Amino acid sequence: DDFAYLNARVRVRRGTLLKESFFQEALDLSFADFLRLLSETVYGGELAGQGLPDVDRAVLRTQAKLVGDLPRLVTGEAREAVRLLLLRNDLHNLQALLRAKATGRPFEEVLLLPGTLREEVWRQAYEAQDPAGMAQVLAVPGHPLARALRAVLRETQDLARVEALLAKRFFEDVAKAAKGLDQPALRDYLALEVDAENLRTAFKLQGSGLAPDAFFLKGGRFVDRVRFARLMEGDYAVLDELSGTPFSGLSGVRDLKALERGLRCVLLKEAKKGVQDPLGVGLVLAYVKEREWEAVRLRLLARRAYFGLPRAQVEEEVVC
């Protein structure tokens, strides 16, 4: 098993993470100067073309070899712990894959990177012609996200529903396993991920007339059914009573964009102070949030530069 070698491999990698002062420089640059800067970094090391499709691809391929190769390098008890983190990036691939089989559209225009399910699992799944067979091919790597899929697929074959019940059931699955793999660092974070999900499920489905109890799943810290119901009526006075959590910063805010920005920045923060717990999954935890967030800012800074958008429209979203 064991994170002893694996943590060590990641510590060398934390050396080539992009510090805050790069994005600071990049805003001052035009697209031509941005491109010269980008090539110094490790995302730059996969670059294959000046234009936009190529920037999206260099970023993605950097994430595929430095982050998406982690579950293979461990096994067992190590592997389950690392796997839960990786699983969110796999769910994104799965939801798109499930949707290409079902609505008959090509394999293309989806997210592919390795994680827990390999590239070949997604190709064999795609080519499967019965949803049940599609499901056994997915169940081969082993993970809680299969077991979550399997139960939802028994109730339904409707696209929109499978998507929602899979996500709900999946975070519930994740939580139980994670609580049983211990460590304070992971527990604090898990709580925030669920709390953030809860808020966020409420925002995405806002005003659809639905049940507010459906947007609250266990794992919480301070949020409950009533806050959800008020929130659903359109009242944001609930967020103004929400303190003692690091979402203290959501108070007095009522725009969906500022609210959701806020949750992603909070989750970033928890993970960045998990490096005072680098033992076990703590360090990897911090490493994945930072590679993800970094990749996102280079894509936003590249878009902002190419189309000559307003600076303040993106300067605020590239810092927490």
**Residue 320 in contact with another protein, rule: CB under 8 A:** no
Residue 301 CB, nearest distance to another protein (Å)? 20
d(CA 295, CA 57): 11
Binding characters for another protein, 13-42, by CB under 8 A (x = yes): xxxx-------------------x------
Binding characters for another protein, 125-164, by CB under 8 A (x = yes): --x-x---------xxxx----------------------
**Residue 312 in contact with another protein, rule: CB under 8 A:** no
Among 20, 25, 40, 77, which residue sits at the site for another protein (rule: CB under 8 A)? 77
Phi then psi for 7, rounded to 5 degrees? -55, -40
Among 75, 156, 157, 251, which residue sits at the site for another protein (rule: CB under 8 A)? 75
Count of residues making up the chain: 320
Among 56, 277, 290, 317, which residue sits at the site for another protein (rule: CB under 8 A)? 277
Query: Which window, 56-64, 72-80, 87-95, 260-268, contacts another protein (CB under 8 A)?
Result: 72-80
Residue 210 CB, nearest distance to another protein (Å)? 28
Residue 313 CB, nearest distance to another protein (Å)? 27
Which residues, numbered 212-231, are part of the site for another protein (CB under 8 A)? 221-222
Among 54, 56, 188, 260, which residue sits at the site for another protein (rule: CB under 8 A)? 188
DSSP string, the chain: --SHHHHHHHHHHGGGSPPHHHHHHHHHS-HHHHHHHHTTSSGGGG---SSHHHHHHHHHHHHHHHTTTGGGG--HHHHHHHHHHHHHHHHHHHHHHHHHHHH---S-SS----SSS-HHHHHHHHT--SHHHHHHHHHSS--HHHHHHHHHHHH---HHHHHHHHHHHHHHHHHHHHHTT--HHHHHHHHHHHHHHHHHHHHHTTTSS--SGGG--S--SS--HHHHHHHHHT--GGGGS--SSGGGGGTT---HHHHHHHHHHHHHHHHHT-TTS-TTTHHHHHHHHHHHHHHHHHHHHHHHHHTT--SHHHHGGG--
Nearest to another protein of 51, 220 (CB atom):
220
Among 28, 53, 76, 109, which residue sits at the site for another protein (rule: CB under 8 A)? 76
Q: Is residue 250 within 8 Å of residue 223, measured between CB atoms? A: no
**Residue 184 in contact with another protein, rule: CB under 8 A:** yes
Among 29, 73, 268, 320, which residue sits at the site for another protein (rule: CB under 8 A)? 73
Residue 76 CB, nearest distance to another protein (Å)? 5
Give me the residues that bind another protein (CB under 8 A), please: 1-2, 4-9, 11-16, 36, 72-77, 127, 129, 139-142, 184, 187-188, 191, 221-222, 244-245, 273, 275-279, 283
